[PDB]
């Protein structure tokens, strides 16, 4: 679990969005596994606007942060799960690192701010949904 809180927005994994997220929906994209809802309180986070390919992510199944080298956002095949049919997920970045069910929502950050959130994983890999192209999150 986990979310990004920026301005009057909450960014979560679409497959983990709550009834309240859907009732306050701003934007969602099943192909990116992202959903953004509106909040009444001002958020705690700031978003990176960069092309960093190194950063640090929070891994809840180890209660630890790990440094990672990650690929540029791209279209990657994701096998069927309880949440989605087999499909290509867009704006996804892979890295070698631990992740298991429950780790989605963990934040990936570089020196410039929040880059994205854990969205996929397995076999010593961890995949992050990028948020750096969502310029409207800042206004």
Ligand X SMILES: NC(=O)[C@H]1CCCN(C(=O)Nc2ccccc2SC2CC2)C1
Q: Does 104 bind ligand X (CB under 6 A)?
A: yes
Q: Do residues 104 and 95 lie in contact, with contact meaning Cβ atoms separated by under 8 Å?
A: no
Indicate if the alpha-carbon torsion angle 5, 9, 82, 120 is positive or negative. Answer: negative
**Which residue among 33, 37, 58, 134 contacts ligand X (CB under 6 A)?**
33
**Which residue among 88, 122, 133, 138 contacts ligand X (CB under 6 A)?**
122
- Among this protein's residues, is 91 annotated catalytic? no
Among candidate residues 33, 81, 110, 19, the one with its CA nearest the CA of residue 11 = 33
- Among this protein's residues, is 59 annotated catalytic? no
- Going by the DSSP 8-state scheme, the letter that residue 47 receives in this structure is B
- End-to-end CA gap in the chain: 25
* All residues at 6 or more sequence positions from 101 whose CB lies less than 8 Å from its CB, including other chains: none
Q: Answer yes or no: is 59 a known binding residue.
A: no
Residue 122: burial class (beta carbons within 10 Å; 0-12, 13-18, 19+): exposed
**Which residue among 97, 103, 116, 128 contacts ligand X (CB under 6 A)?**
103
Q: Does 59 bind ligand X (CB under 6 A)?
A: no
Q: Three-class SS of residue 76? A: strand
Nearer to Zn ion, 50 or 125 (CB): 50
**Which residue among 52, 56, 76, 78 contacts ligand X (CB under 6 A)?**
78
Q: Answer yes or no: is 50 a known binding residue.
A: yes
Which range binds ligand X by CB under 6 A, 19-27, 37-45, 49-57, 94-102?
94-102
Could you list the residues that contact ligand X (CB under 6 A)? 15, 33, 78, 81, 83-84, 89, 99-101, 103-104, 119-122
Residues labelled as active-site residues: 15, 33, 104
């Amino acid at each position: 679990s986990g979310a990004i809180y920026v301005g009057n927005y909450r960014v979560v994994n679409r497959h983990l969005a709550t009834h309240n997220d859907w009732a306050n929906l701003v934007w969602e994209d099943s192909s990116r596994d992202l959903l953004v809802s509106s909040t009444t309180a001002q958020g705690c986070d700031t978003i990176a606007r960069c092309d960093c390919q190194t950063g640090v992510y929070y891994c809840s199944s180890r209660r630890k942060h790990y440094p990672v080298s990650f690929s540029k956002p791209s279209l990657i095949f994701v096998e069927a799960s309880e949440y989605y049919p087999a499909r290509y997920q867009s704006h996804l970045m892979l890295a070698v690192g631990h992740s298991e069910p429950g780790d989605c929502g963990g934040i990936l950050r570089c020196q410039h701010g929040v880059v994205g959130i854990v969205s996929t994983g397995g076999n010593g890999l961890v995949g992050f949904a990028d948020v750096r192209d969502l310029l409207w999150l800042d206004e």
